[PDB]
Amino acid sequence: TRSSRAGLQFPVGRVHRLLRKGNYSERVGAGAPVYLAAVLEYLTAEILELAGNAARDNKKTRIIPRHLQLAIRNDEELNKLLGRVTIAQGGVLPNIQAVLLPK
Amino acid sequence: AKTRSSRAGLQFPVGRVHRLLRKGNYSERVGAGAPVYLAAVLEYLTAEILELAGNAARDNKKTRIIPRHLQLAIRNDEELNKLLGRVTIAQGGVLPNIQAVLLPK
Amino acid sequence: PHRYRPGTVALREIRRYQKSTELLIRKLPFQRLVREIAQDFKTDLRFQSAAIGALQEASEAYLVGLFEDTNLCAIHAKRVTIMPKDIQLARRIRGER
Amino acid sequence: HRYRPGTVALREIRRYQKSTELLIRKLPFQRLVREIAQDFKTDLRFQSAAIGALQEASEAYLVGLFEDTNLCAIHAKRVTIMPKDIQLARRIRGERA
Amino acid sequence: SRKESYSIYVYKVLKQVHPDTGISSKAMGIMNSFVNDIFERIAGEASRLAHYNKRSTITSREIQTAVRLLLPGELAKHAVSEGTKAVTKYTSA
Amino acid sequence: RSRKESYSIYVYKVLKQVHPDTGISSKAMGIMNSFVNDIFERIAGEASRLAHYNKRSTITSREIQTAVRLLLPGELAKHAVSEGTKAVTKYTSAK
Amino acid sequence: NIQGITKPAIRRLARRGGVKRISGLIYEETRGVLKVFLENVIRDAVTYTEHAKRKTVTAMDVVYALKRQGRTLYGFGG
Amino acid sequence: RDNIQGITKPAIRRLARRGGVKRISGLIYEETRGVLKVFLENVIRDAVTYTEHAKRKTVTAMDVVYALKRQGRTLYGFGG
DNA sequence: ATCAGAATCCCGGTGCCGAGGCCGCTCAATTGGTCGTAGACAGCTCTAGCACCGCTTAAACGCACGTACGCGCTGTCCCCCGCGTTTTAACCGCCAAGG
DNA sequence: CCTTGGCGGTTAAAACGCGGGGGACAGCGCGTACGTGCGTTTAAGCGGTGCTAGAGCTGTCTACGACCAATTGAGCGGCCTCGGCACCGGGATTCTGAT
């Protein structure tokens, strides 16, 4: 694809065909699909950088949905992004209130 | 009778309804009778709102509709407020809400 | 000149505010607040009067709704007076921090 | 032996907030979902993935609701929650009119 | 140019509902915004569901099920009942 | 028989670049596909809204550039904008 | 059914829900809330399935359904 | 300047009363200003971004409505 | 302080099942060339907005009078859990099989 | 072939009973700021008022994008034998409660 010459991991042509399939507009410039692919690639790279370190934290190499969920919930901007969107087998970060603790 | 709304017993312009669906990047094609049904539904909604809106306007001895009466009509009805729970109407204010502890004994 | 016990004229003012629909907050202080807030992001801006009125109406509606939720929290805690911890309780549950 | 009350519950909270096991078993949940869907059309096949999605969404939302309810109850200096606590938690977001 | 509005349409809807009740320009804009945003919601749902059906056109049953999904239950049912008669009248004539 | 499109090896190679000794599960590939598709859905909807509101038909790089600053927080959005602008310049300069 | 859900299920849900203890009326209230939420999701999901004129309710139908209320669930073809 | 604290005390008192409140604490006004600061920040930032997309240094009444529609606070009677 | 009663996590052995390694593929991305319609450079404009400026009586800041609600204190009531002991069932462990 | 149906059965999930003793809760005391009035200060409401800015609208030139026509190689469909953690055996160390 053209992503090799653009220095992008995610192919741009798939993004272009995704834009064409939904009929979101009559025409789209050439910069929009490459920009969208770059933004998606950067977001996925950040998420996977967090997920790999999370896997290494527990002396592990594989990633299950729990690791991705915890990586999303650890950050604040990313938690804001996934504020009201549910993830399968996600769960919630542990939280124990103070007044519940025995004295 | 020339307009398509005359043949459908409606008054919303079918051409205007279909114009946005065509030049709005919604789909490759849109139906011709579907705008008739959508306009019928929209007209029913407008009439439904206007019933209690005019009732509220008349009950206050203010024949001309003010936005406060529209807000009261929208938020008083369960269905209308459920449709417009996050929706605020201009110059409408808020529903009178007084609980038990607020009022003195 | 006579004084009534607390809770008499407060309810009268509450009913006066709720019955009417005109914006209680004066236009100029809130519009100057909006100007100051907007100046922090982009400089040398011009603001339409209708847009500022829309922002004022939306802010008043949101604040009244949040205060109703605060009242619900206060009644829940066996109280009448509202304090900021009620707003903290309501905003986190709503999801707006 | 008999532990001090509340410590076992917090230990259960800690061990469940880190575990990925399904809290609600699939069979009663599937039967309830089928019965609910049968109010309109009978003999409605539900996929295993569809049932899993339904239970995951229900558990996530209801856990969030319990977190909000606990926040309300603690905000009233209480630990065990009450139907008033649930009412406040559901009303704060805006779902309840 | 000529920006299309619902002013005369709103006038006729009042004359069909509350002929003796006046309307203000604020109420005019409020009703225009109501019709506009409900129209946008229904059209967006129709587009999404057409994309769900692997289809490039929108039928009447798609709009009826969109009304059933979006509008509140009793309100949606009454809207469907009123719209079916209009569809039948349009088709027959 | 239709052969769909996913991010199976795309996500795997990106993870390899950021963490060479890190695996991933079968469910996680589908979840990442759903995540990226949902983000793309939001971005496409915002691009359509921006084009239509400004009375336009062609969605250039600028519409997405503005929509990112709305979708992502200011600093993360700034990083995304910088990376996307670099990609656009690289695409335009190259063939 | 609605009454088929057991006490330890709601107890462990509260444990993951950050609630240390829940009263007797909480069991009934939680069953009611869970049932009404299930019906709210099921109405949209089953209606979407019916519009497709198909018997088996596909999993993706929840994604189309929970999209309406802004609570879309990932991992099922989104 | 100093318009964040320049909001009159009885105005926020009126807002609290409209929220059905009978007893209003003195810190409620400060909390209201603090929350409204960010509440205005978010919406005004979104609106200014919308204006900046179209090479505009002036906010139109349509852009605010567009931003509110995106955020989920659609306003009636003001166009859009 | 000072003791145990069991609670839960880590190392190591077993091993296994899918995660990736890898081959065939076919269609989706690439792209030479062609024509076009909102895109855009540039200009006319023109009134709602920017901004200042003055006058005035309604709203706000200050502040006393006082007292009632939030917080604290004292005491009282009792209840889902902790466990003991018992309860019965969701899914494993199997098949057919059909729409 | 992805869904349906049946048939048996068992330890994990859970159900009745004793008793709790800290958690939930009613009531009583107490302090200070919030309700309510007015005295007095205030820059805001309203009206002028001068200027004018940039975006709405339009003349005009049109560049790269949808598409025709064609083309090719890599990600997905499908295999397969091996490895990172599933899963348990059996062990040390930290809590939690009673003393």
UniProtKB/Swiss-Prot annotation, chain A:
Gene Ontology molecular functions: DNA binding; protein heterodimerization activity; structural constituent of chromatin
N6-glutaryllysine carried by residues: 80, 103
Oligomer status and interactors: The nucleosome is a histone octamer containing two molecules each of H2A, H2B, H3 and H4 assembled in one H3-H4 heterotetramer and two H2A-H2B heterodimers. The octamer wraps approximately 147 bp of DNA.
Family: Belongs to the histone H2A family.
Sites of N6-crotonyllysine modification: 21, 103
Keywords annotated in UniProt: Acetylation, Chromosome, Citrullination, DNA-binding, Hydroxylation, Isopeptide bond, Methylation, Nucleosome core, Nucleus, Phosphoprotein, Ubl conjugation
Sites of N5-methylglutamine modification: 89
Modified residues (N6-(beta-hydroxybutyryl)lysine): 21, 80, 103
Origin: domain of life: Eukaryota
Principal location: nucleus
Modified sites of kind N6-(2-hydroxyisobutyryl)lysine: 21, 59-60, 80, 103
One GO cellular component term noted in the UniProt record for this chain: nucleus
Biological process, per Gene Ontology: chromatin organization; heterochromatin formation; negative regulation of cell population proliferation; protein localization to CENP-A containing chromatin
Subcellular location: Nucleus; Chromosome
Protein name per UniProt: Histone H2A type 1-B/E
Organism in which the protein naturally occurs: Homo sapiens
Gene of this entry: H2AC4
Residues with PTM N6-succinyllysine: 80
Chain's role: Core component of nucleosome. Nucleosomes wrap and compact DNA into chromatin, limiting DNA accessibility to the cellular machineries which require DNA as a template. Histones thereby play a central role in transcription regulation, DNA repair, DNA replication and chromosomal stability. DNA accessibility is regulated via a complex set of post-translational modifications of histones, also called histone code, and nucleosome remodeling.
UniProtKB/Swiss-Prot annotation, chain C:
Consequence of substituting residue 83 to I: In BRYLIB1; decreased protein abundance
PTM-bearing positions, type N6,N6,N6-trimethyllysine: 19, 42
Modified residues (N6-acetyllysine): 19, 42, 78, 85
Effect of residue 18 to K: In BRYLIB1; uncertain significance; no effect on protein abundance
Effect of mutating residue 84 to R: In BRYLIB1 and BRYLIB2
Positions of post-translational N6-(2-hydroxyisobutyryl)lysine modification: 19, 27, 42, 85
Main location: nucleus
PTM remark: Acetylation is generally linked to gene activation. Acetylation at Lys-85 (H3K122ac) by EP300/p300 plays a central role in chromatin structure: localizes at the surface of the histone octamer and stimulates transcription, possibly by promoting nucleosome instability. H3R2me2a is present at the 3' of genes regardless of their transcription state and is enriched on inactive promoters, while it is absent on active promoters.
Top-rank taxon, per record: Eukaryota
Alphabetical keyword list: Acetylation, ADP-ribosylation, Chromosome, Citrullination, Disease variant, DNA-binding, Hydroxylation, Intellectual disability, Lipoprotein, Methylation, Nucleosome core, Nucleus, Phosphoprotein, Ubl conjugation
Clinical note on disease: Glioma: Gliomas are benign or malignant central nervous system neoplasms derived from glial cells. They comprise astrocytomas and glioblastoma multiforme that are derived from astrocytes, oligodendrogliomas derived from oligodendrocytes and ependymomas derived from ependymocytes.
Protein name according to UniProt: Histone H3.3
Source organism per UniProt: Homo sapiens (Human)
Full-sequence portion shown in this chain: 39 to 135 of 136
From Swiss-Prot, chain F:
Residue numbers bearing the N6,N6,N6-trimethyllysine modification: 55
UniProt modified residues of type Omega-N-methylarginine: 56, 62
Residues with the N6-malonyllysine modification: 86
The UniProt record lists the keyword Phosphoprotein: yes
N6-acetyllysine, modified sites: 55
Molecular functions per Gene Ontology: DNA binding; lipopolysaccharide binding; protein heterodimerization activity; structural constituent of chromatin
Protein name: Histone H2B type 1-J
Gene: H2BC11
Residue numbers of the full-length protein present here: 32 to 126 of 126
UniProtKB/Swiss-Prot annotation, chain G:
Modified residues (N6-propionyllysine): 7, 20, 53, 55, 67
Keyword annotations of the record: Acetylation, Chromosomal rearrangement, Chromosome, Citrullination, Disease variant, DNA-binding, Hydroxylation, Intellectual disability, Isopeptide bond, Methylation, Nucleosome core, Nucleus, Phosphoprotein, Ubl conjugation
Cellular component annotations (GO), alphabetically ordered: CENP-A containing nucleosome; chromosome, telomeric region; extracellular exosome; extracellular region; membrane; nucleoplasm; nucleosome; nucleus
Cellular location(s): Nucleus; Chromosome
Modified residues annotated as Phosphoserine in this record: 23
Parts forming coiled coils: none
Covalent S-S links between cysteines: none
List of residues that carry N6-(2-hydroxyisobutyryl)lysine: 7, 20, 35, 53, 55, 67
Effect of residue 67 to Q: In TEBIVANED1; results in severe early developmental defects when expressed in zebrafish embryos; results in defective cell cycle progression when expressed in zebrafish embryos
Residues the record lists as N6-succinyllysine modifications: 7, 53, 55, 67
Residues annotated with N6-(beta-hydroxybutyryl)lysine modification: 7, 53, 67
Post-translational modification: Acetylated as part of spermatogenesis progression prior to histone-to-protamine exchange.
Residue positions, PTM Phosphotyrosine: 27, 64
Cross-link annotation Glycyl lysine isopeptide (Lys-Gly) (interchain with G-Cter in SUMO2), location: 7, 35, 55, 67
Modified residues (N6-lactoyllysine): 7, 53, 67
Function: Core component of nucleosome. Nucleosomes wrap and compact DNA into chromatin, limiting DNA accessibility to the cellular machineries which require DNA as a template. Histones thereby play a central role in transcription regulation, DNA repair, DNA replication and chromosomal stability. DNA accessibility is regulated via a complex set of post-translational modifications of histones, also called histone code, and nucleosome remodeling.
The protein, known as: Histone H4
Organism: Homo sapiens
